Design a binder for these strands. Structure first.
Ligand code: MG
Ligand code: MG
Ligand code: MG
Ligand code: MG
Ligand code: MG
Ligand code: MG
Ligand code: MG
Ligand code: MG
Ligand code: MG
Ligand code: MG
Ligand code: MG
Ligand code: MG
Ligand code: MG
Ligand code: MG
Ligand code: MG
Ligand code: MG
Ligand code: MG
Ligand code: MG
Ligand code: MG
Ligand code: MG
Ligand code: MG
Ligand code: MG
Ligand code: MG
Ligand code: MG
Ligand code: MG
Ligand code: MG
Ligand code: MG
Ligand code: MG
Ligand code: MG
Ligand code: MG
Ligand code: MG
Ligand code: MG
Ligand code: MG
Ligand code: MG
Ligand code: MG
Ligand code: MG
Ligand code: MG
Ligand code: MG
Ligand code: MG
Ligand code: MG
Ligand code: MG
Ligand code: MG
Ligand code: MG
Ligand code: MG
Ligand code: MG
Ligand code: MG
Ligand code: MG
Ligand code: MG
Ligand code: MG
Ligand code: MG
Ligand code: MG
Ligand code: MG
Ligand code: MG
Ligand code: MG
Ligand code: MG
Ligand code: MG
Ligand code: MG
Ligand code: MG
Ligand code: MG
Ligand code: MG
Ligand code: MG
Ligand code: MG
Ligand code: MG
Ligand code: MG
Ligand code: MG
Ligand code: MG
Ligand code: MG
Ligand code: MG
Ligand code: MG
Ligand code: MG
Ligand code: MG
Ligand code: MG
Ligand code: MG
Ligand code: MG
Ligand code: MG
Ligand code: MG
Ligand code: MG
Ligand code: MG
Ligand code: MG
Ligand code: MG
Ligand code: MG
Ligand code: MG
Ligand code: MG
Ligand code: MG
Ligand code: MG
Ligand code: MG
Ligand code: MG
Ligand code: MG
Ligand code: MG
Ligand code: MG
Ligand code: MG
Ligand code: MG
Ligand code: MG
Ligand code: MG
Ligand code: MG
Ligand code: MG
Ligand code: MG
Ligand code: MG
Ligand code: MG
Ligand code: MG
Ligand code: MG
Ligand code: MG
Ligand code: MG
Ligand code: MG
Ligand code: MG
Ligand code: MG
Ligand code: MG
Lengths: 210, 147
RNA sequence: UCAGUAACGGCGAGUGAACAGGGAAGAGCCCAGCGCCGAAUCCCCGCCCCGCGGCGGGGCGCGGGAAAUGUGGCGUACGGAAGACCCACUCCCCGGCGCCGGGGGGCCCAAGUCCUUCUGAUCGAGGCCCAGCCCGUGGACGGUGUGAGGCCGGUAGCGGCCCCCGGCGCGCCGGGCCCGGGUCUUCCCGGAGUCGGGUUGCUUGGGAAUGCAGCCCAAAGCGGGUGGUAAACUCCAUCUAAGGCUAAAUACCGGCACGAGACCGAUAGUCAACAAGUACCGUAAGGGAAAGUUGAAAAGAACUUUGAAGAGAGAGUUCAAGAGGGCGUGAAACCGUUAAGAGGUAAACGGGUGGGGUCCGCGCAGUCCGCCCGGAGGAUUCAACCCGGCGGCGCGGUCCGGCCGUGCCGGCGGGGCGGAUCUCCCGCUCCCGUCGGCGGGGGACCGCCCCCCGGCCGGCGACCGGCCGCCGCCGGGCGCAUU
RNA sequence: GGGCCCGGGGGGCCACGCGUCCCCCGCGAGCGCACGGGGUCGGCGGCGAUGUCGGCUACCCACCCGACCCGUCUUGAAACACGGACCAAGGAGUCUAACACGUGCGCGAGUCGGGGGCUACGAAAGCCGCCGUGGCGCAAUGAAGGUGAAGGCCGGCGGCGCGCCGCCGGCCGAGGUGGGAUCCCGAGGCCUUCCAGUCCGCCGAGGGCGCACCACCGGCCCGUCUCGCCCGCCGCGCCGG
RNA sequence: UGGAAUGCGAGUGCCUAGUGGGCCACUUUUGGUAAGCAGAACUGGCGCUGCGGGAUGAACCGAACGCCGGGUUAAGGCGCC
RNA sequence: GCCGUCGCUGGCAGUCGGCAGAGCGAGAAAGAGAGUGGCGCGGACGCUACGCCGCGACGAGUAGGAGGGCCGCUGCGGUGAGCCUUGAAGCCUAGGGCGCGGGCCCGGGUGGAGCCGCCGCAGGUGCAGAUCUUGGUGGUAGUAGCAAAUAUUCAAACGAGAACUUUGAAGGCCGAAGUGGAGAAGGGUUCCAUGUGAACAGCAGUUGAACAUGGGUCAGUCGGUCCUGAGAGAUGGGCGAG
RNA sequence: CCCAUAUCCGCAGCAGGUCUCCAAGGUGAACAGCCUCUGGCAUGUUGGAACAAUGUAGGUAAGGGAAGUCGGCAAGCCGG
RNA sequence: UUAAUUAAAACAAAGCAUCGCGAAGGCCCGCGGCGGGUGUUGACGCGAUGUGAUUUCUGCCCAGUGCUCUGAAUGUCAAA
RNA sequence: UUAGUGACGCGCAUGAAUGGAUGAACGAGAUUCCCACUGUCCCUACCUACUAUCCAGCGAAACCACAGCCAAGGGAACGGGCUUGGCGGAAUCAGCGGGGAAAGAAGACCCUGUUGAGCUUGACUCUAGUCUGGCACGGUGAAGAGACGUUUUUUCACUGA
RNA sequence: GCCUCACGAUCCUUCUGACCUUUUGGGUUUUAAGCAGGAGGUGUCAGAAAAGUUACCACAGGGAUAACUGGCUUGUGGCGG
RNA sequence: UUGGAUUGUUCACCCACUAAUAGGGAACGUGAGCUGGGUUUAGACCGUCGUGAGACAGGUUAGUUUUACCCUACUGAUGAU
């Protein structure tokens, strides 16, 4: 029964919730198990980077996050094509490929193409047969220095373009941001109806004319 | 801890703090929010006006990312840049104003609560309030709209 | 995390996801179809070589069958194929054979039973020269007549030895493949009683209907589906259904094998610490207990005697049977006996005394202490001075040296951190060899901090030494007695 | 009777220096007793080793006064109301979640690593910082589209005709009234041989700045209503302010 | 001259349990023949509360309670118990 | 007089000592002020400030709330150079005491191996009740009772022991729809021999269907076995998520 | 082997329940009741001594004859 | 016939009288079917009710509620 | 003679297969009277057996706050306890049924509960079954009537489902 | 309406109102949903959607509550002035 | 302060005798004293009522009556000071 002032509460405990309680006492054990598998995986694939294949740069969807870039799933076939990397060869040298992803704009495309060219420049490639090097294999002098890389490959960061202070021009002072904003909403709101009214008037005037 | 609680003090006192007459019974009055329009009506009306009924339009598949618009008032505007940014601009003679990009700080709309220092500034933002634009213009600043 | 949110709901009670974002993990693929290849494909039998406890590899059969009602190779929406032209190619796998570098099992690896001593027995107590019994990468735990690092098993150790299994490498034999990229030219390209629609029932947060199903209707090919309010028109965006495979991160009150615990401690904890899913009940489905402990060691009481015997009396073992085989301790209720007291208003009870007991005071000539007076004695004998040590304090009116200021000033000071403060080197890239942009770097500047040097003030009471002075204390001298 | 029991011609006074001017007519010493800020004696006596001394309470007994059986529901229980023959052991407000307020601690317009990752006790603890995603807080309001939190003065001009509106440049600036802990000033005053005049303190009428908080009055933001005149332009609008 | 007497330190905010069967008496009072009946007002009680008195008794009369010594009382008493 | 509560939001850091000077309770604001001119070596206690001290008033209590427990129980981190086989826990006690109380300390006895104080942490933490659970024991009480179906007696034997066993003899009963002789179902060794007389056989027993130690069930022909009965039940088929 | 006032089921050696076969003499209509032979048993989970009340189960009653009681319940009468 | 408080006047019964049905049927079972019972049946039968031997009789009421029969003549009337 | 029987009948509220009236035989069915009989009674007595009884052996259970003499009082309005009186003397045996508002079983009666269940129906909401229409399986051919070679409908046939 | 009575939440439906908002990738148009105000009604009138019977009965309780006795009262009954 | 017929009856009425045939309480005395006729379970019939299941201070018939050995009281029996 309610008693004086308070909040009205609706706990979701009307089922057999005690039959499905998930405790977390195995949490330290999971952390050790996952860590022990990261290490055993890093040893297995050494000297390949422990983090995994290089990932592209992508912009997060929606207006809440489109100011941020993060690691994608894989490089697009257009990005790989522009960088001259065969799509089936890309995975064999630690490049992640995403055939689903599209490139709508050039800047994002060229950002990931430079990424692939920079990664290709840091790639140390061991010959398939150690004793018999081949055309693209790295020289022996840089194979000695090859060491496993920790952390994501070429980590992705959000870098802001610092704009230095500048004298404000009379044209910026005279700009009306709020009036511009309010009129932009109104024009978008009334665009369809205005054209419909305009079209009828043309027909309305034409019928009298002819 | 159980040693600091009433039960330890209620040993030997028969009823245990629930009375000899009314006793502690299972669920008098109902369970949960029962009776809201009935024997519990005074409590609900007195403390929860508006609780019963419906108001306004429904919206299916609401996506709260579409209405994302963090706001900042003008009185906190200069905290988005460094302290030396303000003093260097204040004391410089060429008249160059620093650019404050609120979107970089994580805000979209600029609001007008507060008073600005007497110092020109260029403010970039997706949105402005009317009073924010005038206060920014009153100090010799300029509003810049970004997308 | 979104989020108890959008939504659902006698819009009551109640119910209730997703996307984005951050992480764990990360892996992608294959058909039918459309085509081209002389079915180029597959199964089985018989013989020869190899292997043979995962039945396979090669060779030979005018051996048998499957399969044109479609097997195999290429190829699948990320497009693919054929041709031409440029460019580039020798390692990739299968079946055998040989050689070189984690898992399971077995055995083993430090130091006191030292000297006294308590005990039934001890692992107890005391000691073990300077220095501090000995070892210690081992002081987890268990056992042993307490209570043990050193008595035994163990424990520690990138300790040792011996078996087997595996993994990773390197060569030989017999096979299979005769393998790719780019630019052009010409071609090819898809899953139907399914989608979709109506209606019914269920289901969902899914609301003019989220998913599923039945019945009816029943497709198209610039089509189809989705685009969270029914519908027409119109642009857009985004996928490509009705075929298929796929590790990892996730789950795990059963099973095998282990480790631990601020848990319970025999009416507890599993029903079950034990011949417990037992005994027992029910025709059956089913239901289902109680029940741990002698002692260090059986040394488990020989023998004598009364009795028909059970039982007793002695005797003996043991530290103890005042531990005697349902035996550790051994409570209360209840009972016997012994002792004391008492007794016709049931007993019991509160207050106040009195009498009598049991024991206690380990009582019964009655306290202790400071100073002072007097009588008898006796001395590691007092003060005052001298030597030495230590300590306290000092405005030493203002001594020297130190560290040092979460103080202030002066520096060609030698540096770290940070900055939404400014700006000669290079990587990629647009354009002509030029010239602009993204990204990576000096340098300057500002703030703070650390270390170096000079000047003031300043602490050493969370932070001190040397001299000097005063005072106190201690040790040793001298004082040898009206102290 | 009242006038320090007004003025004149045997018994008690908390009268008892003096130079005076004149209304009127600043410290003696001792000594002692006490109806004096709560009891002392600087007063005494008997008894004591085998039967005596002290021992509240406790064991038993007696007597006088008191005295109904507890728990429970109940207006009312000793009840002819229910449970309780007796003893032991067990036996009932817990833990999870959510919320509210109070308190304690940390940091503070921020705060929180809880998920993840790194590096015997230890499944601990330590760390991350371009792991702060994210939660809560920092902004409200409207069903929503959306909007989203002080002004005045000076000078100049345009319009209406000293006052009003619009646009331009300079100066001040987050309201006021009442109360209000505390703080601030200070008229005057805080003694010793007597005067002047100081330094440090100290008290204080009156007067001030006024914390928090409360009441009241203004203001600002969003919804809505009434009235009304203007201002803007890449879109001249069923536009925007 | 803080503008009658008297007494007394006040104001304010959060959180909050139990209760929500009552019953009795003086006076007033409704229904009822009346009831130790039913139903109201006022105040005080009992409930929650012992204690002296009414022999005995929820409510009557006196008086309210820490553990004590002395004194004195209230209401009631003083043939004997 | 004493105890506690509340109030004075009372007092005490001044234990300021021979680098000394003892006071600030008193009717009535503010200095035991500072200056400039005119022999002995001595002096109690205190102050866990969460402490200590003073003065005044007050003290009923169900339901209910709150505080304080140097009240009590179990375990955990610290600490007590803690206790303990020269005796732990537990238990008992007309022994001595402390505290308003919850309780606790010590003495004596038994016991035989572990236990406690303090600062913190934690909780399956405190019983008189619930026709509470489980176990034990009372009075009732040597009581109700050991009364359905006619019945026993004499002698001897064994034996420690005889109303009840065995033998003999009497007197009786069932009275061939039996208290006789054999089976089915059910039991499952109860059957037979020998032994025992602990427990059981509601007295006793020398006895038993008890206990113990050993034996005992023989088939072509007697049954099962085979047949079909009422019925049950696969396959084919049908239905069905299964 | 028991086959049931002790071998089975009713918690038991429980006056209950539990399917069958054989079947003597006398009296008598008779597989009635009563007595006996063959066969069996020991009085039904104890004995001794008394002979009060009240019982349970059997009897008998002068004179009356249902007056008793709700009612002839019970007993009695009749009986081959 | 109410095992274990009712043995009866209750139930049944022969008799009597109604009702459905000629098998693709009546009545009934069954989650289900080319399922099943009546039924190895066929109206002198099967199924469903009432009354209750014999004797004698069984009167009036079709408004109500039921049951039943006729229906494009025809108001309302679902989906398609 | 509140009984029985026979009559009467404006019958609270008799009556015709919800069967009315009757009637032999039958009944562990209900009722009245008469003969006979008797201990049912007047009005009780005596006798037998088995108990009870006492003894030896053996031996429970129900129940129990503490208990156990009364009058009155007041009191939860009927006390074993309390107040005032009457009074009170160990330990026991056989009986007894006044009391313990004795035991037995959380009253079946009655009410309350937003507790049920069996049953009923003109309760509310449904539901198997059943009747009915449509769509599908679902076809072949002649005629009749419609509508614009096709198409709806009626009748008559066909067979192959 | 001379005054003191003459009446009705949420949800839902229906009507009226705006150059109204939304109708979810945009635009037009139907539709639908919003916003404000009326009405449709709950008379158990602060507003469930609702017939019986039980003697075949059940459980939790109740001396809060009827059927005996007892208690107060004594109208009625009885008895007496 | 009586014996009887009718009634379960209390009550009533009548017959008969008698001195008289008075009235009452004791938990409307008295069911571990009986009986069980009535009332008041479950079976069943009739009438009235109800669509019905069922109901009826309306008739009718059939329908289990438990325990004392405790305490007291009482009756007797030993005994006790
Ligand atoms: Mg409440
Ligand atoms: Mg209390
Ligand atoms: Mg409480
Ligand atoms: Mg209670
Ligand atoms: Mg309550
Ligand atoms: Mg209540
Ligand atoms: Mg509760
Ligand atoms: Mg939230
Ligand atoms: Mg759900
Ligand atoms: Mg996501
Ligand atoms: Mg990852
Ligand atoms: Mg193909
Ligand atoms: Mg695809
Ligand atoms: Mg060793
Ligand atoms: Mg030693
Ligand atoms: Mg050891
Ligand atoms: Mg050991
Ligand atoms: Mg050692
Ligand atoms: Mg070793
Ligand atoms: Mg090892
Ligand atoms: Mg597909
Ligand atoms: Mg369902
Ligand atoms: Mg649902
Ligand atoms: Mg839409
Ligand atoms: Mg799969
Ligand atoms: Mg046990
Ligand atoms: Mg157990
Ligand atoms: Mg036990
Ligand atoms: Mg225990
Ligand atoms: Mg056990
Ligand atoms: Mg034990
Ligand atoms: Mg011993
Ligand atoms: Mg022992
Ligand atoms: Mg032992
Ligand atoms: Mg034991
Ligand atoms: Mg023992
Ligand atoms: Mg004793
Ligand atoms: Mg004695
Ligand atoms: Mg007395
Ligand atoms: Mg109660
Ligand atoms: Mg009451
Ligand atoms: Mg009581
Ligand atoms: Mg009473
Ligand atoms: Mg009760
Ligand atoms: Mg009881
Ligand atoms: Mg807080
Ligand atoms: Mg661990
Ligand atoms: Mg009253
Ligand atoms: Mg009360
Ligand atoms: Mg009070
Ligand atoms: Mg009082
Ligand atoms: Mg009186
Ligand atoms: Mg006094
Ligand atoms: Mg008196
Ligand atoms: Mg108090
Ligand atoms: Mg004792
Ligand atoms: Mg031991
Ligand atoms: Mg615990
Ligand atoms: Mg306990
Ligand atoms: Mg207990
Ligand atoms: Mg006897
Ligand atoms: Mg026989
Ligand atoms: Mg035989
Ligand atoms: Mg015996
Ligand atoms: Mg035998
Ligand atoms: Mg079958
Ligand atoms: Mg006999
Ligand atoms: Mg015998
Ligand atoms: Mg027998
Ligand atoms: Mg017998
Ligand atoms: Mg006679
Ligand atoms: Mg005669
Ligand atoms: Mg008679
Ligand atoms: Mg009579
Ligand atoms: Mg008879
Ligand atoms: Mg019967
Ligand atoms: Mg019978
Ligand atoms: Mg009929
Ligand atoms: Mg009709
Ligand atoms: Mg008669
Ligand atoms: Mg007649
Ligand atoms: Mg008729
Ligand atoms: Mg009739
Ligand atoms: Mg005897
Ligand atoms: Mg009594
Ligand atoms: Mg008494
Ligand atoms: Mg009695
Ligand atoms: Mg009774
Ligand atoms: Mg009850
Ligand atoms: Mg009951
Ligand atoms: Mg209610
Ligand atoms: Mg129901
Ligand atoms: Mg049922
Ligand atoms: Mg209906
Ligand atoms: Mg008018
Ligand atoms: Mg509602
Ligand atoms: Mg669209
Ligand atoms: Mg009935
Ligand atoms: Mg009734
Ligand atoms: Mg009455
Ligand atoms: Mg009268
Ligand atoms: Mg009576
Ligand atoms: Mg009686
Ligand atoms: Mg009786
Ligand atoms: Mg009767
Ligand atoms: Mg009946
Ligand atoms: Mg009728």
């Amino acid at each position: 029964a309610p008693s004086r002032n308070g909040m009205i509460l609706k706990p979701h405990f009307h089922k057999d919730w005690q039959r499905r309680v998930a405790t977390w006492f195995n949490q330290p054990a999971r952390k050790i198990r996952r860590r022990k598998a990261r290490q055993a995986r890093a040893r297995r694939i050494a000297p390949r980077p422990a983090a995994g294949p290089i990932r592209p740069i992508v912009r997060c969807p929606t207006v809440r996050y489109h100011t941020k870039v993060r690691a994608g799933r894989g490089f697009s076939l257009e990005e790989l094509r522009v960088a001259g990397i065969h799509k089936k060869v890309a995975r064999t040298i630690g490049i992640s490929v995403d055939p689903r992803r599209r490139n709508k704009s050039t800047e994002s495309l060229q950002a990931n193409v430079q990424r692939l060219k920079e990664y290709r420049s840091k790639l140390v490639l061991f010959p398939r047969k150690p004793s018999a090097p081949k055309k693209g294999d790295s020289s022996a002098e840089e194979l000695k220095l090859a060491t496993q890389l920790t952390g994501p490959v070429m980590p992705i960061r959000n870098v802001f373009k610092k704009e230095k202070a500048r004298v404000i021009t009379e044209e910026e002072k005279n700009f009306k941001a709020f009036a511009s904003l309010r009129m932009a909403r109104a024009n978008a709101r009334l665009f369809g109806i205005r054209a419909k009214r305009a079209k009828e008037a043309a027909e309305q005037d034409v019928e009298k004319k002819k | 801890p159980s040693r600091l609680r009433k039960t330890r003090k209620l040993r030997g006192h028969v009823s245990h703090g629930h009375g000899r007459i009314g006793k502690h019974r299972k669920h008098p009055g109902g369970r949960g929010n029962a009776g809201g329009m009935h024997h519990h009506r005074i409590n609900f009306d007195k403390y929860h006006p508006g609780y019963f009924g419906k108001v306004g339009m429904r919206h299916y598949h609401l996506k709260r990312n579409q209405s994302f618009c963090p706001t900042v008032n003008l009185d906190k505007l200069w905290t988005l840049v460094s302290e030396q940014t303000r003093v260097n601009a204040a004391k410089n003679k060429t008249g160059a104003a620093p650019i404050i990009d609120v979107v970089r700080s994580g805000y979209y709309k600029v609001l007008g609560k507060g008073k600005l220092p007497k110092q020109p500034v260029i403010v970039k933002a997706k949105f402005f309030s009317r009073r924010a634009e005038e206060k920014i213009k009153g100090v010799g600043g300029a509003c810049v709209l970004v997308a």
